[PDB]
Ligand binder design. Structure first.
Ligand code: NA
Ligand code: NA
Length: 247
């Protein structure tokens, strides 16, 4: 991984030791990227709803993962399921239960630093995984990206600054998540998020993440070329808010 410090260094060290699992995938790969593009063509707002029980940026919410995913299946373009355990209270069992229950695309969000974590995502039923530029070297990014594609997965590349975006382009990213939240400081900077979006080629699928809570924000980001919107804590607290955000 990169040279890190503090809690980011901690979660990366823990992820390096994450025990792998054994299971049989019993699901096709259902591409998040393609379904975004399909929603864009049908002029349907594409919201990726996040399931996360805990985070550094919110209070805990303990709610049924299957109900949440079944409710979201009718509205969301895909689901993001947290599997990081210490800081997000996620689990691979959340992802397994949800993947077994619904047929929309699923992104496993975790600090992916080794190949066995991509095996775990594939074997559990995730369609894609988050590759976070803040923690991975160029060499690690290129290698894990190729390994995920060997399973037929197209990872989402997570960025929050210009240097991250340059690396995401260098590695041939096809879907980028532009998060307005800095993973180390938890600051939300939407001016920087718009500047990053303006520098991404038109043929890369763009997902805006963090701090989105209003239909007016979505409309304005769509007009700037954003293709989909990752929305977490607002929907964890009030899942049915998705109906209004898509209207
Ligand atoms: Na290990
Ligand atoms: Na787990």
């Amino acid at each position: 991984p990169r040279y890190l410090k503090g809690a980011l260094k901690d979660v990366v060290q823990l992820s390096l030791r994450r025990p792998s699992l054994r299971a049989s995938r019993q699901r096709p790969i259902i591409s998040l990227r393609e379904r975004i593009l399909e929603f864009n063509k049908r002029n349907i707002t594409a919201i990726i709803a996040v399931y996360k029980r805990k985070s550094p940026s919110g209070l805990d919410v303990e709610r049924d993962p299957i109900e949440y995913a079944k409710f979201m299946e009718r509205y969301a373009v895909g689901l993001v399921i947290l599997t990081e355990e210490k800081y997000f209270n996620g689990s691979y069992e959340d992802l397994r239960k949800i993947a077994s229950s619904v047929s929309i695309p699923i992104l496993m969000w975790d600090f992916i630093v080794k190949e066995s974590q991509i095996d775990d995502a594939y074997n559990l039923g995730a369609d894609t995984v988050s590759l976070i530029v803040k923690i991975l070297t160029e060499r690690e990014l290129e290698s894990l990206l190729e390994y995920a594609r060997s399973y037929g997965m197209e990872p989402a590349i997570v960025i929050n600054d210009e240097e991250d975006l340059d690396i995401a382009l260098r590695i041939g990213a096809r879907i980028i998540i532009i998060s307005s939240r800095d993973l180390e400081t938890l600051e939300i900077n939407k001016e920087n998020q718009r500047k990053l979006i303006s520098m991404i080629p038109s043929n890369v699928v763009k997902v805006a993440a963090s701090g989105i809570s209003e239909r007016n924000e979505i409309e304005e980001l769509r007009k700037l070329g954003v293709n989909a919107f990752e929305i977490g804590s607002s929907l964890m607290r009030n899942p049915e808010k998705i109906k209004e955000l898509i209207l």
